[PDB]
Amino acid sequence: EEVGKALEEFYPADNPIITIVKSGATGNLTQTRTLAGMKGLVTNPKGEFIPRPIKSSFREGLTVLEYFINTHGARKGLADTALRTADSGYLTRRLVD
């Protein structure tokens, strides 16, 4: 949180990476922090938090362990995005009925 704060402060307004965000064109400041700040905490395959955070950005480059433990929750997001559609479909069929 402090890093995202200091980062949206330190950045100028003529910067493109902040401009594309504050213009409403795309993106969030969470991504800008992940890129220029810190990725932060990541999930297990249970869905819990690993209390050892990723203090590295995708600018510094991530170490091997950090990348490995990010892959955990990076694979757990491809199924969720599918099961959610079946839940939505259930409720939508009910309402249309």
């Binding site: 491809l78 995005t81 099961l83 559609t85 079946a86 479909g89 259930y90 069929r93």
Partner: peptide, 30 residues
């Protein structure tokens, strides 16, 4: 029937194949 409504892997209009719900859940658990 909810799952029969959903898009089939052979009727997809996306760029690359991906996970569906028909290959992770069945009627009983849904």
């Amino acid at each position: 029937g909810v799952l029969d409504l959903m898009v089939d892997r052979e009727d997809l209009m996306d760029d690359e194949d991906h996970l569906l719900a028909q290959d992770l859940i069945d009627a009983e658990e849904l």
